[PDB]
Design an enzyme around this catalytic site. Structure first.
Site, mmCIF file in Angstrom:
data_model
loop_
_atom_site.group_PDB
_atom_site.id
_atom_site.type_symbol
_atom_site.label_atom_id
_atom_site.label_comp_id
_atom_site.label_asym_id
_atom_site.label_seq_id
_atom_site.Cartn_x
_atom_site.Cartn_y
_atom_site.Cartn_z
ATOM 1 N N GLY A 191 -5.606 -1.159 -6.466
ATOM 2 C CA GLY A 191 -4.843 -0.353 -5.907
ATOM 3 C C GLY A 191 -4.484 0.622 -6.909
ATOM 4 N N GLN A 192 -3.789 1.661 -6.201
ATOM 5 C CA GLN A 192 -3.337 2.982 -6.962
ATOM 6 C C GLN A 192 -1.872 3.227 -6.824
ATOM 7 O OE1 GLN A 192 -6.016 6.868 -7.344
ATOM 8 N NE2 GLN A 192 -4.682 6.286 -9.052
ATOM 9 N N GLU A 197 -3.301 2.828 -12.060
ATOM 10 C CA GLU A 197 -4.074 1.857 -11.210
ATOM 11 C C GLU A 197 -3.901 0.228 -11.480
ATOM 12 O OE1 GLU A 197 -7.775 3.513 -11.919
ATOM 13 O OE2 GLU A 197 -7.845 4.713 -10.129
ATOM 14 N N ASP A 303 13.438 -2.103 -9.785
ATOM 15 C CA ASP A 303 12.244 -1.306 -8.656
ATOM 16 C C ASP A 303 11.950 -2.586 -7.737
ATOM 17 O OD1 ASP A 303 10.667 0.389 -7.636
ATOM 18 O OD2 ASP A 303 9.044 -0.117 -8.760
HETATM 19 N N1 LIG Z 1 -0.930 -9.091 -10.594
HETATM 20 C C1 LIG Z 1 -1.443 -8.406 -9.427
HETATM 21 N N2 LIG Z 1 -2.329 -9.507 -8.818
HETATM 22 C C2 LIG Z 1 -3.110 -9.048 -7.736
HETATM 23 N N3 LIG Z 1 -2.815 -7.853 -7.221
HETATM 24 C C3 LIG Z 1 -1.640 -7.008 -8.003
HETATM 25 C C4 LIG Z 1 -1.271 -7.326 -8.833
HETATM 26 N N4 LIG Z 1 -0.229 -6.639 -9.338
HETATM 27 C C5 LIG Z 1 -0.369 -5.394 -8.536
HETATM 28 N N5 LIG Z 1 -1.341 -5.498 -7.622
HETATM 29 C C6 LIG Z 1 -1.815 -4.878 -6.393
HETATM 30 O O1 LIG Z 1 -2.003 -3.461 -6.687
HETATM 31 C C7 LIG Z 1 -1.095 -2.471 -5.886
HETATM 32 C C8 LIG Z 1 0.090 -1.934 -6.608
HETATM 33 O O2 LIG Z 1 -0.443 -1.206 -7.442
HETATM 34 P P1 LIG Z 1 1.157 -0.485 -8.509
HETATM 35 O O3 LIG Z 1 0.525 0.605 -9.265
HETATM 36 O O4 LIG Z 1 1.704 -1.718 -8.852
HETATM 37 O O5 LIG Z 1 1.944 -0.079 -7.045
HETATM 38 P P2 LIG Z 1 3.231 -0.167 -6.025
HETATM 39 O O6 LIG Z 1 3.133 -1.244 -5.160
HETATM 40 O O7 LIG Z 1 3.012 1.240 -5.231
HETATM 41 N N6 LIG Z 1 4.637 0.154 -6.837
HETATM 42 P P3 LIG Z 1 4.945 0.887 -8.304
HETATM 43 O O8 LIG Z 1 4.165 0.144 -9.297
HETATM 44 O O9 LIG Z 1 6.333 0.379 -8.425
HETATM 45 O O10 LIG Z 1 4.733 2.292 -8.109
HETATM 46 C C9 LIG Z 1 -0.888 -3.144 -4.535
HETATM 47 O O11 LIG Z 1 -2.171 -3.275 -3.707
HETATM 48 C C10 LIG Z 1 -0.832 -4.670 -5.093
HETATM 49 O O12 LIG Z 1 -1.135 -5.657 -4.602
#
Ligand SMILES: Nc1ncnc2c1ncn2[C@@H]1O[C@H](COP(=O)(O)OP(=O)(O)NP(=O)(O)O)[C@@H](O)[C@H]1O
Length: 450
Positions: A191-192, A197, A303
């Protein structure tokens, strides 16, 4: 003086040692903490091993069915796994009676379905071990051996040892922390986010990990390194472990990979179609458990939201991305403004005066509670980010979600009190949610049912 492997372990480096469950090992140097130098008595190979994967030979901890200090709730989650045949068990330490133990067993009722029965094991003044006074044993292993042949009063004969997952090692390997950028291979984009990322990848060509990348200019590596040192000391079963880092830009954050993804996405879709109240409340309880640890440690998340909760097997939930938000140097984000700031989960005193505390995290947990009871629906449905703070400052609060019990909405409202100190603690929230459906984790069978 020999030890025994409790689980199978695959070598991740050139200097560690691989082994299979049940292998006998000689700790030829234990002057460490989490990684010990060992020598296999069967293969003759030497190398470092994770200390939490072995137990002294003939110790009770060496027993396959001995789970030690696991709570009653956690033992229930493991025993209730759909694949477990009836009579699946484990033995653990009693929480209400020091020095006592407990035999937990899986059972099926045609008028209750799958369920767990708990039996407290008392150790007499003389020395006997017993569930029922009419049958004592000189050891826990003797007791277990008996009920494996005859139920004798128990809900079912002891049939299968409760399966469990390999525990996390502390660190990827001995002395590994600030690792070389080239030791990682990115494989699948997960994901992003807003500042980088996330990818599923591999470390040293052997270990599966999750890698988060931060766009240059996001936060200073120096401040990042200082904060990573603190987060590194946080260890709890409901917290995603921080494994290693690459402190120079572009910054890398290596954590444990959660295959089931985020709670938000798991909430929406098909994965959460037949998800009922009892399940959602248990997930909330797990989240409160990790946040209560955060609370005990005098830390602050900053957060907390469903997007930052990760899912694993057995509906396991873990708190992720804690602490980082504070390092974001973004001008708008720093002023609690911008399309990058999660204003819908932010307590008013945090947004207005930047007062981020465990109490503003409690407010965030209340909002998270609404996502859990609305299949991941976005908070304040009809409001745009730019008008949320003014509305909440004037006293507006989301109403009870459709289908959500008023009792649970009342909990949310407590989390959203104007006065931060009037908001409940995470210790309280964890107890309330764990005992929501009449079950303060008490009740142990008497003894002989027939
Ligand atoms: N440790 C992990 N194992 C599997 N998937 C993960 C993991 N950490 C993050 N993800 C995935 O990646 C995305 C999160 O990317 P991230 O940059 O953390 O964005 P966010 O969820 O929008 N919040 P933030 O990071 O607080 O801006 C989502 O699709 C999550 O499922």
């Amino acid at each position: 003086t020999t030890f025994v492997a409790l689980y199978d372990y695959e070598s991740r480096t050139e200097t560690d040692l691989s082994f299979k469950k049940g292998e006998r090992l000689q700790i030829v140097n234990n002057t460490e903490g989490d990684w010990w130098l060992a020598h296999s008595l069967s293969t003759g190979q030497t190398g470092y091993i994770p200390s939490n994967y072995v137990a002294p030979s003939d110790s009770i901890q060496a027993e396959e069915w001995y789970f030690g200090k696991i709570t009653r709730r956690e033992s229930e989650r493991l025993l209730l796994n759909a694949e477990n045949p009836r009579g699946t068990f484990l033995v653990r330490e009693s929480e209400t009676t020091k020095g006592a133990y407990c035999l937990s067993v899986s059972d099926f009722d045609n008028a209750k379905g799958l369920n767990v029965k708990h039996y407290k094991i008392r150790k007499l003044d003389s020395g006997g071990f017993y569930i029922t006074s009419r049958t004592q044993f000189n050891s826990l292993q003797q007791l277990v051996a008996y009920y494996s042949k005859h139920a004798d009063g128990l809900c079912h004969r002891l049939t299968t040892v409760c399966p469990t997952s390999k525990p996390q090692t502390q660190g990827l390997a001995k002395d590994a922390w600030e690792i070389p950028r080239e030791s990682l291979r990115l494989e699948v984009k997960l994901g992003q986010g807003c500042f980088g990322e996330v990818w599923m990848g591999t470390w040293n060509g052997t270990t599966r990990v999750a890698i988060k990348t931060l766009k240059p200019g996001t936060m200073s590596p120096e401040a990042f390194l200082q904060e990573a040192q603190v987060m590194k000391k946080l260890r709890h079963e409901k917290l995603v472990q921080l494994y290693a880092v690459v402190s120079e830009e572009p910054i890398y954050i290596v954590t444990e990979y959660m295959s089931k993804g985020s709670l938000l996405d798991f909430l929406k879709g098909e994965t959460g179609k037949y998800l009922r109240l009892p399940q959602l409340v248990d997930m909330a309880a797990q989240i409160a458990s990790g946040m209560a640890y955060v609370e005990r440690m005098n830390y602050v998340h900053r957060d907390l939201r469903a997007a930052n909760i990760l899912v694993g097997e057995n509906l396991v939930c873990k708190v992720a991305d804690f602490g980082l938000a504070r390092l974001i140097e973004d001008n708008e984000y720093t002023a609690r403004q911008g399309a990058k700031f999660p204003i819908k989960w932010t307590a008013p005193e945090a947004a207005l005066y930047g007062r981020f505390t465990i109490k503003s995290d409690v407010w965030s947990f209340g909002i998270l509670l609404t996502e859990l009871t609305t299949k991941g629906r976005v908070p304040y449905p009809g409001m745009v980010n730019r008008e949320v703070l003014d509305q909440v400052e004037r006293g507006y609060r989301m109403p009870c979600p459709p289908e959500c019990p008023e009792s649970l909405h009342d909990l949310m409202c407590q989390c959203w009190r104007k006065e931060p100190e009037e908001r409940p603690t995470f210790e309280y929230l964890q107890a309330f949610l764990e005992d929501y459906f009449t079950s303060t984790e008490p009740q142990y069978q008497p003894g002989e049912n027939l």
